């Protein structure tokens, strides 16, 4: 526990100080003594104590940026999936062992206290989590970086499983307060909505607007042991400065920051979402302009400011910057545009067309009339450039236009982003290539230099040192601690593929993690899992494209094969699937019910017993990912080739000693390249094969007709085998698979099942399983978000990263 060297030193005076300040906070902050104090009181006492250690560095870091005046990086995102903060802060400040000892001496278990903290679940999945990893890496690389978002009162809903169905409950994460954030009501700024434009003698004027105030809350972002503490600034909506009804109606403006939209696909043009997006953009850009003016005329703006757009969600930053520069700063259009493009860069996070933001022009006209005017002018000038570059190419003009012309006229926000950014990047090599080749081919041909790749990454602090200290320790024992912020050093572990001690230790750590996770499920849910089974894990948001359904088909295959040949040995498995479904995505909710329904049959068949178990992991979130990923043996990354832009869960599993079964999709391709394909369980159609199927038409019936085992499963689903009380329950799933499957589940069924057999074959050989694991861990280095951020810095932002310590 405390013997772990990567967790730092428990200095005698440090431990003494920590205990004293713990007791001080219990007394003065929590207003309790030890007679009435609860575990929650103790968590908060520790949280305040740890937070105090950030303050000096936080003040000094921000003063340093004022003095040194580096180029500032502004990372704009509607989501920051931060998770818990206590352990991360202790890790980054080298205080973990000291706090562990301090709390131990006070008679407390720090790990029990850690479990009290709510996730800051201010994101849906990978995109939100990427922002969080990025904040961490930017601080570790000494960048003058600022995360800007919205402080949702309610993050992603807490998922309850009831009768085998998902139920949503409000994520009241601020119930007991947030000890990390600092409210800054003094720095509140006005955001404007609705109104109209007056074009006068001075120029355009946005008048008769309704005001919503944006109150910032600043959260410290510690770099890894470099004394850097950057800031995440999140804006909270506040009403501006019968009688009773009027006071109650303040809620309407304040609803802007009430809740995170829980849909992570199928764009719905909700006005409240558009208000949220402008809210972040308007308040953030005021901060940016203010800081620019208080630094040392707008010619130098792009030299001192970078705005990174996390998806198209903050794309309004482009017309907002133009609005400020033209209408308020009185710059000519051309200069303002030069500045805007050099300031802004855009990161694209998916190719699925239903995820794209296309706002009706009527909505923009009503809510943001000046922005619509500016967008139209941007479009006219941009299309003039297209017309000059490709004379007579009229369809190209139609395809490239920011304006989409259908029954409802809409603004394509991706097109706006490309036009208004000096850099556009995809999030894995395959994804960035498809952007240039198909999705934004017209844009690539116009401005090829704009288009970049920045393969995603994950922070090895949260995703190794925090969640898997046992693995972090056995690595450090061989190669020292430098890898923690220089993950490419993991390649040194290839020297240990034949090392008996290391092979033993890798396997020991995995078993320890599996025991711990089993203990978690027993403690929290009274669910018993076989610790001597292969932990087969698919955790990620529930999506047709991610193909949890393909996993389901395999699980039933395993079950049916057992029933056909009960005497035949099979490698025992615990198949775990978890993830949230978007509230209004019928198929996703049906998929969750199918997983639980499969479990209802499999988990109670006496012929099967502990040889096969199927469990749905409830409420998958960052804190749960930190528990389950280090316990995983097999990582399910089985999206239809061409659909997962990158993935990041894939990287977490690789770093944590799981082997991967996956398609050649997103960053899976680069992961297999790094490790060697011989060390990955790659199966299924490549993008080229998917396209060939699309060319001739996907007929699911053909696979049904040719595969007896698939036929059996579909008939079980149709006849009510997995829902005897409601035989037609899964008719919609069957219908979709048979007739309306965009993601070709049946087409990868045979290769998936065969590939899974090879997984089982290798697991039967513990030594060779572990050796292949070593080959994976050792080559996961590329997938550090430090590498990713270093690339953003050098290739887009024009800043040089530095691991150099502050005093």
Ligand X SMILES: O=C(Cn1cc(-c2ccccc2)nn1)N[C@@H]1O[C@H](CO)[C@@H](O)[C@H](O)[C@H]1O
Instruction: Supply 14's token pair.
Output: 């440090």
Residues 488-517 that bind its own copies (CB under 8 A): none
Beta-bridge partners for 162 = 165
Residue closest to 344 by CA, chosen among 294, 402, 389, 281: 281
Query: Quick check: 455 binds ligand X (CB under 6 A)?
Result: no
676's contact among ligand X, its own copies, none, with CB below 5 to 8 A by partner kind, is none
Q: How many residues bind its own copies (CB under 8 A)?
A: 45
Tell me the C-alpha to C-alpha distance, in Å, between residue 563 and each of 558, 711, 718: 9, 16, 19
Residue closest to 151 by CA, chosen among 72, 222, 217: 217
DSSP for 373-433, written as a single string: HHHHHHHHHHHHHHHHHSTT-HHHHHHH-SEE-SSS-EEEHHHHHHHT-SEEEESSHHHHH
User: In degrees rounded to 5, what are phi and psi of residue 309?
Assistant: -95, 110
Active site (annotated) includes residue 349: yes
* Alpha helix (H) residue ranges in 6-164: 12-24, 39-68, 86-92, 96-105, 110-114, 126-140
31's contact among its own copies, ligand X, none, with CB below 5 to 8 A by partner kind, is its own copies
Instruction: Supply 679's token pair.
Output: 């060390």
Candidate list 263, 379, 401, 623; residue touching ligand X; CB under 6 A: 263
Contact 718, 734 (CB under 8 A): yes
Going by the DSSP 8-state scheme, the letter that residue 640 receives in this structure is: P
Q: x/- contact string, 184-213, with its own copies (CB under 8 A)?
A: -xx---------------------------
Residue showing tokens 């941007």: 378
| Interface stretch with its own copies, choices 80-88, 237-245, 602-610, 698-706 (CB under 8 A) | 237-245
| Interface stretch with ligand X, choices 42-50, 396-404, 504-512, 646-654 (CB under 6 A) | 646-654
Q: How many CB atoms lie within 10 A of CB 731?
A: 15
Task: Report the interhelical angle of 731-739 vs 708-719 (nearest 10°).
Answer: 140
How big is the chain, counted in residues?
807
CA distance 44 to 41: 5
CA distance 178 to 120: 9
Residue 806 CB, nearest approach to ligand X (Å): 30
Task: Report the interhelical angle of 96-105 vs 39-68 (nearest 10°).
Answer: 150
Tell me the C-alpha to C-alpha distance, in Å, between residue 62 and each of 185, 387, 789: 19, 46, 20
Residues 128-147 that bind ligand X (CB under 6 A): 130
**Given the residues 462, 546, 580, 775, the one annotated as active site:** 546
Contact 459, 87 (CB under 8 A): no
Candidate list 140, 373, 574, 646; residue touching ligand X; CB under 6 A: 646
User: In degrees rounded to 5, what are phi and psi of residue 587?
Assistant: -60, -45
59's contact among ligand X, its own copies, none, with CB below 5 to 8 A by partner kind, is its own copies
Going by the DSSP 8-state scheme, the letter that residue 445 receives in this structure is: H
- Cβ neighbors of 373 (< 8 A, separation 6 or more) are 197, 204
SS3 440: coil
Residues 136-155 that bind its own copies (CB under 8 A): 154
Residue 218 CB, nearest approach to its own copies (Å): 8
Instruction: Provide the CA 140 distance to its chain's centre, in angstroms.
Output: 19
C-beta closer to its own copies: residue 207 or 248: 248
Instruction: Supply 585's token pair.
Output: 């995505």
**Given the residues 347, 648, 660, 770, the one annotated as active site:** 648
CA distance 711 to 756: 19
Task: Compute and round to an integer the Cα radius of gyration of the chain.
Answer: 27
Instruction: Supply 33's token pair.
Output: 């003594």
User: Is 33 one of the annotated binding-site residues?
Assistant: yes
Residue 785 CB, nearest approach to ligand X (Å): 11
Active site (annotated) includes residue 381: no
311's contact among ligand X, its own copies, none, with CB below 5 to 8 A by partner kind, is ligand X
Contact 658, 633 (CB under 8 A): yes
CA distance 144 to 599: 50
Residues 322-351 that bind ligand X (CB under 6 A): 349-350
Query: Quick check: 38 binds its own copies (CB under 8 A)?
Result: yes
| Interface stretch with ligand X, choices 25-33, 119-127, 281-289, 547-555 (CB under 6 A) | 119-127
Query: Quick check: 10 binds ligand X (CB under 6 A)?
Result: no
Residue 411 CB, nearest approach to ligand X (Å): 16
User: Is 40 one of the annotated binding-site residues?
Assistant: no
Residues 59-98 that bind its own copies (CB under 8 A): 59
Active site (annotated) includes residue 546: yes
User: Is 81 one of the annotated binding-site residues?
Assistant: no
Residues 615-644 that bind ligand X (CB under 6 A): 644
Query: Quick check: 291 binds its own copies (CB under 8 A)?
Result: no
User: Is 291 one of the annotated binding-site residues?
Assistant: yes
C-beta closer to its own copies: residue 169 or 482: 169
User: Is 294 one of the annotated binding-site residues?
Assistant: yes
CA distance 337 to 378: 9
Active site (annotated) includes residue 540: yes
Residue 12 CB, nearest approach to its own copies (Å): 23
Query: Quick check: 401 binds ligand X (CB under 6 A)?
Result: no
Query: Quick check: 544 binds ligand X (CB under 6 A)?
Result: no
DSSP element (H, E) containing 695: helix 687-696
Query: Quick check: 52 binds its own copies (CB under 8 A)?
Result: yes
Residues 350-389 that bind ligand X (CB under 6 A): 350, 355
**Given the residues 51, 349, 461, 782, the one annotated as active site:** 349
Query: Quick check: 37 binds its own copies (CB under 8 A)?
Result: no
Residues 567-606 that bind its own copies (CB under 8 A): 583-584
Residue 318 CB, nearest approach to ligand X (Å): 19
Residues 244-283 that bind its own copies (CB under 8 A): 244, 246-248, 250-251, 255, 258-259, 261-262, 270, 272
Q: x/- contact string, 264-293, with ligand X (CB under 6 A)?
A: xxxx--------------------------
| Interface stretch with ligand X, choices 261-269, 475-483, 562-570, 743-751 (CB under 6 A) | 261-269
SS3 210: strand
Residue 457 CB, nearest approach to ligand X (Å): 10
Q: Which residues bind ligand X (CB under 6 A)?
A: 125-127, 130, 261, 263-267, 311, 349-350, 355, 427, 456, 644-648, 666
Q: Which residues bind its own copies (CB under 8 A)?
A: 27-28, 31-33, 38, 40-41, 52, 55-56, 58-59, 154, 157, 168-170, 172, 175-177, 182-183, 185-186, 239, 241-244, 246-248, 250-251, 255, 258-259, 261-262, 270, 272, 583-584
* Residues forming the active site: 349, 540-541, 546, 648, 652
In the annotated binding site for AMP, the residues are 33, 66, 290-296
């Amino acid at each position: 526990r405390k013997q772990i060297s990567v967790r730092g030193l428990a200095g005698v005076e440090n431990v003494t100080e920590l205990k004293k300040n713990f007791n001080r906070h219990l007394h003065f902050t929590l207003v309790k003594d030890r007679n009435v104090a609860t575990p929650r009181d103790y968590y908060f006492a520790l949280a305040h104590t740890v937070r105090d250690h950030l303050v000096g560095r936080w003040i000094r870091t921000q003063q340093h940026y004022y003095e040194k005046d580096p180029k500032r990086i502004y990372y704009l995102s509607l989501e920051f999936y931060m998770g818990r903060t206590l352990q991360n802060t202790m890790v980054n400040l080298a205080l973990e062992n000291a706090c562990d000892e301090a709390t131990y001496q006070l008679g407390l278990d720090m790990e029990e206290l850690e479990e009290i903290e709510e996730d800051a679940g201010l994101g849906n999945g990978g995109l939100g989590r990427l922002a969080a990893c990025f904040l961490d890496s930017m601080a570790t690389l000494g960048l003058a970086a600022y995360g800007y978002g919205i402080r949702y009162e309610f993050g992603i809903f807490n998922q309850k499983i009831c009768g085998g169905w998902q139920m949503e409950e409000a994520d009241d994460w601020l119930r007991y307060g947030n000890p990390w954030e600092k409210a800054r009501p003094e720095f509140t700024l006005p955001v404007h909505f609705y109104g109209r434009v007056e074009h006068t003698s001075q120029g355009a004027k946005w008048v008769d607007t309704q005001v919503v105030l944006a109150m910032p809350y600043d959260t410290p972002v510690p770099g890894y042991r470099n004394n850097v503490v950057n800031t995440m600034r999140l804006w909270s909506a506040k009403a501006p400065n019968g009688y009773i009804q009027a006071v109650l109606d303040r809620n309407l403006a304040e609803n802007i920051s009430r809740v995170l939209y829980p849909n992570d696909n199928f764009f719905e043009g909700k006005e409240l979402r558009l208000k949220q997006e402008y809210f972040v953009v308007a308040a953030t850009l005021q901060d940016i302009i203010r800081r620019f003016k208080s630094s040392k005329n707008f010619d130098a703006f792009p030299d001192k400011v970078a705005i990174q757009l996390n998806d198209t969600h903050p794309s309004l930053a482009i017309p907002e910057l133009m609005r400020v520069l033209v209408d308020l700063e009185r710059l000519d259009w051309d200069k303002a545009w030069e500045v805007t493009v050099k300031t802004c860069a855009y990161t694209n996070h998916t190719v699925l067309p239903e995820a794209l933001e296309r706002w009706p022009v009527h909505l923009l006209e009503t809510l943001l009339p000046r922005h619509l005017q500016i967008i139209y002018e941007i479009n006219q000038r941009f299309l003039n450039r297209v017309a000059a570059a490709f004379p007579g190419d009229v369809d190209r003009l139609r395809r490239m236009s920011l304006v989409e012309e259908g029954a409802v006229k809409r603004i394509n926000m991706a097109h706006l982003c490309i036009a208004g950014s000096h850099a556009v990047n995809g999030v894995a090599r395959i994804h960035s290539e498809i952007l240039k080749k198909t999705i934004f081919k017209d844009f690539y041909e116009l401005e090829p230099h704009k288009f970049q790749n920045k393969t995603n990454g994950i922070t090895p602090r949260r995703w190794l040192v925090l969640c898997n200290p046992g693995l972090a320790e056995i690595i450090a024992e061989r190669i020292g601690e430098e890898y923690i912020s220089d993950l490419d050093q993991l390649r040194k572990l290839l020297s240990y593929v034949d090392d008996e001690a290391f092979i033993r230790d890798v396997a020991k750590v995995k078993q320890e993690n599996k025991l711990k996770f089993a203990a978690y499920l027993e403690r929290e849910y009274k669910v018993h899992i076989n610790p001597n089974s292969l932990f087969d894990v698919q955790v990620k948001r529930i999506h047709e494209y991610k193909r949890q359904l393909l996993n389901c088909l395999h699980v039933i295959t395993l079950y049916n094969r057992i029933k056909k040949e009960p005497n035949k040995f099979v490698v025992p498995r615990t198949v775990m699937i978890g993830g949230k479904a978007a509230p209004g995505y019928h198929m996703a909710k049906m998929i969750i019910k199918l997983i639980t329904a499969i479990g209802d049959v499999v988990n109670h068949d006496p012929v099967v017993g502990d040889r096969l178990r199927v469990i749905f992991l409830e409420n998958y979130r960052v804190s749960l990912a930190e528990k389950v990923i280090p316990a995983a043996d097999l990582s399910e990354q089985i999206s239809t080739a061409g659909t997962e832009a990158s993935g990041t869960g894939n990287m977490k599993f690789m770093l944590n000693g799981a082997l991967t079964i996956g398609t050649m999709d997103g960053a899976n391709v680069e992961m297999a390249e790094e490790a060697g394909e011989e060390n990955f369980f790659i199966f299924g159609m490549r993008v080229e094969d998917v396209d060939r199927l699309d060319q001739r038409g996907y007929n699911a019936q053909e696979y049904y007709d040719r595969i007896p085992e698939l036929r059996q499963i579909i008939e079980q689903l149709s006849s009510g085998f997995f829902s005897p009380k409601q035989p037609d329950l899964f008719k919609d799933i069957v219908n979709m698979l048979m007739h309306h499957d965009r993601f070709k589940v049946f087409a990868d069924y045979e290769e998936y099942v065969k590939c899974q057999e090879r997984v089982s074959a290798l697991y039967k050989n513990p030594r060779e399983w572990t050796r292949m694991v070593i080959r994976n861990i050792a080559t996961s280095g590329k997938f550090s978000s430090d590498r990713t951020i270093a690339q953003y810095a050098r290739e887009i932002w024009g800043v040089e990263p530095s691991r150099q310590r502050l005093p």
